[PDB]
Design a protein around this ligand. Structure first.
Ligand SMILES: COc1ccc(OCCN2C[C@H]([C@@H](O)CO)[C@H]3CCC[C@@H](C2=O)N3S(=O)(=O)c2cc(Cl)cc(Cl)c2)cc1OC
Length: 123
């Protein structure tokens, strides 16, 4: 299910998380549930404003995949990636911070736009 804004990678095919591959990984497997995943990312709002980036801290963001440690769009999206891959993820609010948002950085009803690089993962 490939739209003009990317591939719908949701289980519901509700257009809530859309993915565009920017660089193919040479890795073969995706990370598994419970793996410790290492990424770099940059997040922007629909107005182009960068709200956060791991690159700006000069160390990776680390989380356990599929454990609800991150927004739903990330547990869905990162699970599709291979080592070395860079993707863009368009994350509708229902897969992110919803109607409330998370002020000051994330407004109400915000679609989030991430560029994510899967650096490594360990089981
Ligand atoms: C199970 O549901 C959730 C779990 C976690 C959650 O937010 C906290 C984790 N988080 C914040 C990180 C980092 O800022 C933590 O140091 C970051 C990267 C991973 C995705 C997402 C993110 O999911 N965010 S974020 O870039 O969207 C973000 C950055 C900033 Cl500065 C502030 C916020 Cl509120 C979000 C939000 C969740 O539901 C709304």
């Amino acid at each position: 299910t490939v739209t003009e804004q990317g591939e719908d990678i949701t289980s519901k095919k509700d257009r809530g998380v859309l993915k565009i591959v920017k660089r193919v990984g040479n890795g073969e497997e995706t990370p598994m549930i419970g793996d410790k995943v290492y990424v770099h990312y940059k997040g922007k709002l629909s107005n182009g404003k960068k709200f956060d980036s791991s690159h700006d801290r000069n160390e990776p963001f680390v989380f356990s995949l599929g454990k609800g440690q991150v927004i739903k769009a990330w547990d869905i999206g990162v699970a599709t990636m291979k080592k070395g891959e860079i993707c863009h993820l368009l994350c509708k609010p229902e897969y992110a911070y919803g109607s409330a948002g998370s002020l000051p950085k994330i407004p109400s009803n915000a679609t989030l736009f991430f560029e994510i690089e899967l650096l490594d993962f360990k089981g």
